[PDB]
Amino acid sequence: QLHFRHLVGEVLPEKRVKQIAAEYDVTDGPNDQGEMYTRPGILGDAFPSP
Amino acid sequence: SRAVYAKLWASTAQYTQRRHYAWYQIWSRVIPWSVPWGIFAMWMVFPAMPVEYRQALTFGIWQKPNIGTHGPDP
Numbered sequence: 001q002l003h004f005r006h007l008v009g010e011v012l013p014e015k016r017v018k019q020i021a022a023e024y025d026v027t028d029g030p031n032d033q034g035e036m037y038t039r040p041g042i043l044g045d046a047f048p049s050p
Numbered sequence: 051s052r053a054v055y056a057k058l059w060a061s062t063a064q065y066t067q068r069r070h071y072a073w074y075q076i077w078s079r080v081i082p083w084s085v086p087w088g089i090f091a092m093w094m095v096f097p098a099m100p101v102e103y104r105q106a107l108t109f110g111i112w113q114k115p116n117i118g119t120h121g122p123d124p
């Protein structure tokens with residue numbers, strides 16, 4: 001239920017939260033070929049799961 | 051006498067003018083109610099306006115509440 005959006009201003013500064021989110025690979029797609037891919041996380045994404 | 055009957059007949063010739071006077075009186079009694087309701091309109095619609103307009107319309111008295119969050123980032 002948690003997204004990085006939740007940490008900025010309430011706990012941490014925005015810049016640091018963006019840098020935290022960048023540490024993870026998050027899956028996204030489909031692309032033009034209908035395949036899925038991975039990208040660096042962004043402020044709008046939910047926490048990852050193991 | 052014709053003269054007196056004419057005066058009595060004519061006494062009410064100006065009905066419409068008296069009715070306009072009545073309009074004036076009742077509206078004068080009524081119209082101040084616009085101030086309470088105007089204040090409440092503005093009360094409700096103030097937080098919808100831009101922050102700059104809130105600051106301006108209160109001659110700079112109003113400012114963003116300070117609740118201890120969302121401070122500057124060095």
Ligand SMILES: CCCCCCCCCCCCCCCCCC(=O)OC[C@H](COP(=O)([O-])OCC(O)COP(=O)([O-])OC[C@@H](COC(=O)CCCCCCCCCCCCCCCCC)OC(=O)CCCCCCCCCCCCCCCCC)OC(=O)CCCCCCCCCCCCCCCCC
Pocket residue numbers: 089092093096097106107108109111112113
């Ligand atoms: C003290 C001793 C004790 C005495 C005891 C006596 C007994 C009485 C008590 C008195 C004691 C104090 C008590 C406390 C009371 C106050 C607290 C209170 O009430 O809070 C409430 C409180 C509300 O809190 P809130 O809403 O969060 O408050 C946020 C603020 O309002 C913040 O909101 P905001 O900032 O967004 O507000 C906006 C505001 C912002 O306000 C301001 O910033 C105004 C600043 C004010 C300054 C003050 C000036 C006066 C002082 C000056 C000093 C003078 C000096 C001289 C004297 C000293 C020296 C001689 O601006 C406006 O309102 C609009 C502006 C004005 C509009 C008019 C238009 C004018 C245009 C101007 C024209 C001029 C040109 C301008 C253009 C520019 C270009 C030129 O209640 C709650 O939180 C809710 C409670 C839950 C209950 C729910 C109710 C029931 C619902 C259920 C219904 C469902 C059931 C069905 C129906 C049932 C029916 C029965």
Ligand SMILES: CCCCCCCCCCCCCCCCCC(=O)OC[C@H](COP(=O)([O-])OCC[N+](C)(C)C)OC(=O)CCCCCCCCCCCCCCCCC
Pocket residue numbers: 091094095097098099100101
């Ligand atoms: C006869 C009058 C009958 C009145 C009945 C009206 C009842 C329903 C009112 C709904 C108002 C909705 C306004 C739409 C805009 C979006 C609101 C909103 O949440 O914005 C975000 C804002 C906060 O913004 P924000 O932080 O989300 O980000 C956007 C920033 N701004 C707003 C600057 C763009 O939330 C609010 O402040 C809540 C809206 C309060 C406005 C209430 C208006 C009440 C209207 C009654 C006045 C009647 C006067 C008499 C008129 C009669 C004339 C004949």
